[PDB]
Amino acid sequence: RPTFYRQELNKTIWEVPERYQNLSPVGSGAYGSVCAAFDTKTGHRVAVKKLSRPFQSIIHAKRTYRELRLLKHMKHENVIGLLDVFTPARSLEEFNDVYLVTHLMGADLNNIVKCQKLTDDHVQFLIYQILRGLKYIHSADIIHRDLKPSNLAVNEDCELKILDFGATRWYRAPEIMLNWMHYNQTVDIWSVGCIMAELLTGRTLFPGTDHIDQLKLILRLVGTPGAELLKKISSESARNYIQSLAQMPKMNFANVFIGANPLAVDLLEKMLVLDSDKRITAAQALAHAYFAQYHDPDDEPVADPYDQSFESRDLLIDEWKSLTYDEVISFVPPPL
Ligand SMILES: CS(=O)(=O)N1CCC[C@@H](NC(=O)[C@H](CCC2CCCCC2)NC(=O)c2ccc(CNc3ncnc4c3cnn4-c3ccccc3)cc2)C1
């Protein structure tokens, strides 16, 4: 067990191993309780996040568990990984505080776009990397559900990591804003479509004042729902609403991206599909011709089996808090 040290940072008690020095608060608050540190073991900068009110309720307890269970699983170049998870607690009796260590983020994809006007070489490479990360995540039966530029970290090499820091609206698949039952991984693909369009056009594709405004901007671009789609909505009320919000004059798809590489527009067209059963998968996307320059199949792995069975459980804080401790004590850092 390592030696820890106390610290007040913005009226917040920060106890960490001494290997993590120069803790400095980052994200102006909005990213939760996060500090930039210096990993003295490796001499790189890192992010320490102290988890906030982690065992307050069943929901918070179970959510603390899922996160640690997820971070510990992600061993892929285009997805966030865990360098370190620690607690000051010398026992389960005392366990209340959880700290997570990751690479420090230099820029989100948002910052990138503010900095520079991206080329088609950039857009190919960036989207290739998101779809690669998604192929891995999807293989483990994990859906991101909140893919957006602020959750995409991008380095000096334009190398990219998918993460979730916790406007979502702009990038959200339409089935979710209509609260339909059926939900597949391709909700993420919709988001990649929205993100890619933004990288091509430099503007929010569906900049919707509210969710109803959003759904109008979508349906005028991706068409009044087809016979095929409507034949999969159950409620008369829902079907009448969906076709009721598709009363904006229809728009021409390729018109919206005049100037873009046609191979890009071709790909966008297979991502921004109303019918999620007919929307392309991450693994198919990787084989699209727009990624000729990068797409290597032998180098686009799937994840290992991910035990998600805890998702279905109604347990007590002390079960959640105990399963969490198990996972903290038993963590094995990645190699350097
Ligand atoms: C459903 S739920 O309810 O469980 N759900 C609630 C909302 C938050 C969700 N988070 C996660 O479950 C994911 C892990 C799940 C994976 C993520 C990848 C896709 C597949 C699923 N967790 C993460 O992705 C994460 C991110 C950062 C950290 C710590 N690291 C930083 N935390 C803040 N800020 C930072 C840094 C680094 N740099 N910066 C930074 C910020 C600003 C400026 C400079 C640097 C820790 C964890 C969980």
From Swiss-Prot:
Superkingdom to which the source organism belongs:
Eukaryota
Q: Where is the protein localized?
A: Cytoplasm; Nucleus
The entry sums up its family as follows: Belongs to the protein kinase superfamily. CMGC Ser/Thr protein kinase family. MAP kinase subfamily.
Q: What is the lineage of its organism?
A: Eukaryota, Metazoa, Chordata, Craniata, Vertebrata
Has keyword Metal-binding? Answer: no
The UniProt catalytic activity note for this protein reads: L-seryl-[protein] + ATP = O-phospho-L-seryl-[protein] + ADP + H(+); L-threonyl-[protein] + ATP = O-phospho-L-threonyl-[protein] + ADP + H(+)
Which gene carries the instructions for this protein?
A: Mapk14
Mark the residues carrying the PTM Phosphothreonine. Answer: T12
Protein task:
Serine/threonine kinase which acts as an essential component of the MAP kinase signal transduction pathway. MAPK14 is one of the four p38 MAPKs which play an important role in the cascades of cellular responses evoked by extracellular stimuli such as pro-inflammatory cytokines or physical stress leading to direct activation of transcription factors. Accordingly, p38 MAPKs phosphorylate a broad range of proteins and it has been estimated that they may have approximately 200 to 300 substrates each.
Query: Which GO terms of the molecular function aspect are on file?
Result: ATP binding; kinase activity; MAP kinase activity; mitogen-activated protein kinase p38 binding; NFAT protein binding; protein kinase activity; protein phosphatase binding; protein serine kinase activity
Modification after translation, per record: Dual phosphorylation can also be mediated by TAB1-mediated autophosphorylation. TCR engagement in T-cells also leads to Tyr-306 phosphorylation by ZAP70. Dephosphorylated and inactivated by DUPS1, DUSP10 and DUSP16. PPM1D also mediates dephosphorylation and inactivation of MAPK14. Acetylated at Lys-49 and Lys-148 by KAT2B and EP300. Acetylation at Lys-49 increases the affinity for ATP and enhances kinase activity. Lys-49 and Lys-148 are deacetylated by HDAC3.
Record note on quaternary structure: Component of a signaling complex containing at least AKAP13, PKN1, MAPK14, ZAK and MAP2K3. Within this complex, AKAP13 interacts directly with PKN1, which in turn recruits MAPK14, MAP2K3 and ZAK. Binds to a kinase interaction motif within the protein tyrosine phosphatase, PTPRR. This interaction retains MAPK14 in the cytoplasm and prevents nuclear accumulation. Interacts with SPAG9 and GADD45A. Interacts with CDC25B, CDC25C, DUSP1, DUSP10, DUSP16, NP60, SUPT20H and TAB1. Interacts with casein kinase II subunits CSNK2A1 and CSNK2B. Interacts with PPM1D.
| InterPro entries referenced in this protein's UniProt entry, alphabetically | Kinase-like_dom_sf, MAP_kinase, MAP_kinase_CS, MAPK14, MAPK_p38-like, Prot_kinase_dom, Protein_kinase_ATP_BS
Q: Does the keyword Transmembrane helix apply?
A: no
- BP terms from Gene Ontology: angiogenesis; apoptotic process; bone development; cartilage condensation; cell morphogenesis; cell surface receptor protein serine/threonine kinase signaling pathway; cellular response to ionizing radiation; cellular response to lipopolysaccharide
EC numbers on record: 2.7.11.24
Entry protein name: Mitogen-activated protein kinase 14
Give the modified residues of type N6-acetyllysine.
K49, K148
For binding ATP, which residues are annotated in this chain's numbering? V26, G27, S28, G29, A30, Y31, G32, S33, V34, K49
State one Pfam family annotation. Pkinase
Q: What is known of its domains?
A: The TXY motif contains the threonine and tyrosine residues whose phosphorylation activates the MAP kinases.
Q: Which UniProt keywords apply?
A: Acetylation, Apoptosis, ATP-binding, Cytoplasm, Kinase, Nucleotide-binding, Nucleus, Phosphoprotein, Serine/threonine-protein kinase, Stress response, Transcription, Transcription regulation, Transferase, Ubl conjugation
The organs and tissues expressing this protein are described as: Macrophages, monocytes, T- and B-lymphocytes. Isoform 2 is specifically expressed in kidney and liver.
GO cellular component terms attached to this protein's record = cytoplasm; cytosol; glutamatergic synapse; mitochondrion; nuclear speck; nucleoplasm; nucleus; spindle pole
Q: Where does the record place the modification Phosphotyrosine?
A: Y306
The record, for Gene3D superfamilies, names:
Phosphorylase Kinase, domain 1 (3.30.200.20), Transferase(Phosphotransferase) domain 1 (1.10.510.10)
> Can you give the residue ranges of the Protein kinase domain?
20-291
